[PDB]
Design a protein around this ligand. Structure first.
Ligand SMILES: Nc1ncnc2c1ncn2[C@@H]1O[C@H](CO)[C@@H](O)[C@H]1O
Ligand SMILES: O=C(O)c1ccc2ccccc2n1
Length: 330
């Protein structure tokens, strides 16, 4: 037996969430629906223009680990915060969910990462992220025993922005594969894919990544195409398993020549799309590490995604395991 189902690795971030009108995005030159990297000065500027807000632990991979644990799986997380109040919040929330989290802060400065997330009337989220302490994540933060004892190690494409995180990920891939485990990544964001297109392709083609998560936008960006069918064919050729999400249109899981389409759950109303892809990965990787069929992994993904988009904030505040039991996915 193993000690963990899923280890995730990401930018440790606290979210600062507010609703805005569409004009706000245009006036502030915020790219809608994207992750927008910002410096400390821009962070202060945007915050001064933001309305009253709510705070919640975030980080894409963090959300994913929390979601695995909520479902009843065993999760761990690597990510670097600062020794400050935001970091203490971050540490509390993820450990409180029963996720193993032992990455040690290096000091108080730079401070813990935060993302100002603006939710428009259509439920879309536009993130503005100051990386702070996340720039310090490196190979020293790899808990080798944790990687070795985890069935799957999953990481963000977003980790390619800070300088040394990629080296930790390469160490992770080596360890995971030497112990017969699997590696997984999410493409994270279509602009992130654009920044690191060749690098991400090489991760898949060299076999460093076994399982890739993408949405439609990321897949189209990856192969620089308007043709979604081309994108699916190419992604299936480049990685062992691909899980591609398509919002209200559900998901498709690809493995060689196999394709498994999965319907999205019908929604009351889309409240806030923040976390949707993260929780799709929770559900998928929980199913995968429980030995479930690829279709059933996709079902568990879409269930968790559907739940998170019906609340404010990125981590479901209700029981995913209960929801899966009621859905017969157990
Ligand atoms: N650069 C980033 N790296 C990792 N996660 C991010 C980044 N910017 C925003 N997020 C997280 O994305 C989550 C939504 O997927 C939010 O909870 C937010 O914290
Ligand atoms: O075809 C492209 O080259 C392409 C496609 C999608 C993109 C999304 C964000 C940034 C750059 C992109 N570039």
């Amino acid at each position: 037996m193993t000690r963990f189902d899923v280890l995730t690795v990401g930018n440790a971030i606290v979210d600062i969430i507010s609703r805005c009108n569409d004009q706000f995005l245009i006036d502030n030159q915020i790219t809608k629906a994207a992750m927008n990297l910002i410096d400390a000065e821009r962070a202060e500027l945007l915050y001064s223009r933001m309305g009253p807000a709510l705070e919640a632990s975030g980080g894409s991979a963090g959300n994913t680990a929390a979601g695995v644990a909520n479902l009843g799986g065993k999760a761990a997380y690597f990510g670097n915060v600062a020794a400050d109040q935001l970091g203490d919040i971050f540490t509390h929330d993820i450990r409180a969910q029963g996720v193993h989290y032992q990455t040690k802060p290096k000091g108080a400065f730079p401070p813990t990462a935060r993302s100002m997330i603006f939710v428009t009337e259509d439920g879309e989220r536009s993130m503005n992220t100051y990386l702070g302490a996340c720039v310090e994540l490196g190979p020293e933060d790899v808990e080798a025993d944790v990687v070795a004892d985890a069935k799957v190690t999953y990481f963000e494409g977003y980790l390619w922005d800070p300088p040394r995180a990629k080296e930790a990920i390469l160490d992770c891939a080596r360890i995971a594969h030497q112990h017969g485990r699997e590696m997984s990544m999410t493409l994270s964001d279509s602009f992130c894919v654009d920044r690191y297109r060749g690098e991400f392709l090489d991760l898949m083609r060299s076999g460093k990544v076994d399982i890739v998560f993408a949405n439609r936008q990321e897949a189209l960006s990856l192969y620089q195409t308007d043709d979604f069918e081309e994108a699916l064919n190419r992604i299936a050729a480049d990685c062992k398993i691909a899980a591609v999400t398509m919002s209200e249109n559900g998901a498709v899981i690809l493995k060689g020549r196999e394709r498994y389409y999965v319907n999205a759950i019908r929604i009351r109303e889309v409240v806030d799309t923040t976390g949707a892809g993260d929780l799709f990965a929770s559900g998928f990787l929980y199913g995968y590490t429980q030995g479930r069929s690829l279709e059933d992994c996709g079902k568990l993904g879409c269930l968790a995604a559907g739940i998170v988009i019906q609340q404010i904030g990125p981590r479901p505040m209700t029981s995913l395991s209960e929801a899966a039991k009621q859905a017969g996915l157990i």
